[PDB]
Design a protein around this ligand. Structure first.
Ligand code: CL
Ligand code: CL
Length: 162
C-alpha cells in the first residue's frame, strides 16, 4: 500500500463535478474546486486547472494528474511548515503517510492546529494521540475515514486499509 493507494481509497474517483461531504464542489480524487456555491464558478475553476473547456467532465488521466499535483503539494506543504515538518521527520514511513492524508484532506493549516496530538505523535505516545485525535470535528463528521487514519497512527501498519 502507499499513499496514493491509501488516498484513492478514502477519496474515491469521480469524473464529473460532485459535492464533497461539506457540500463543496470537487472532482477526481478529492480535488476541491471551490467553496463557492456556484457551479459556474466551479466549472470555471475546473477549466482553469485542466487547461481546456471541460464542461464539468474530465478524463481519468486528467484526474490522476490533479491527484499527483495534490499529493506533491501536500508533502511540500508539510516540509515547509514549521509545525509539521519536525513531526513528519520523526515518524516512520507508514505514519508519515497518515499525516499526509490528513493534510490532503484538511490543509496544512488545519492540521498544524492539532497541537496536542502533534506533540504526542512526536513523542511516540500512540494510544494517547489517537484518543486526542478522535475528539475533533474531523472525527465526528467523517468517522470512518478518521478511524482509518487514526488506526494507522496507532499501529504503524496498513491494517485499516486491508
Ligand atoms: Cl490546480
Ligand atoms: Cl467517513
Amino acid at each position: 500500500m502507499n499513499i496514493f493507494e491509501m488516498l484513492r481509497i478514502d477519496e474515491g474517483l469521480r469524473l464529473k463535478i460532485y459535492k464533497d461531504t461539506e457540500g463543496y464542489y470537487t472532482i477526481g480524487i478529492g480535488h476541491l474546486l471551490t467553496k463557492s456555491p456556484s457551479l459556474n464558478a466551479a466549472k470555471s475553476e475546473l477549466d482553469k486547472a485542466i487547461g481546456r473547456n471541460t464542461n464539468g467532465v474530465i478524463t481519468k488521466d486528467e484526474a490522476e494528474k490533479l491527484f499527483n499535483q495534490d499529493v506533491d503539494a501536500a508533502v511540500r506543504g508539510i516540509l515547509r511548515n514549521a509545525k509539521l515538518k519536525p513531526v513528519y521527520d520523526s515518524l516512520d514511513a507508514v505514519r508519515r503517510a497518515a499525516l499526509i492524508n490528513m493534510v490532503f484532506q484538511m490543509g496544512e493549516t488545519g492540521v498544524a492546529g492539532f497541537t496536542n496530538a502533534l506533540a504526542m505523535l512526536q513523542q511516540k505516545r500512540w494510544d494517547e494521540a489517537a484518543v486526542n485525535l478522535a475528539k475533533s470535528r474531523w472525527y465526528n463528521q467523517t468517522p470512518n475515514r478518521a478511524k482509518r487514519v487514526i488506526t494507522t497512527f496507532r499501529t504503524g501498519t496498513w491494517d485499516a486499509y486491508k
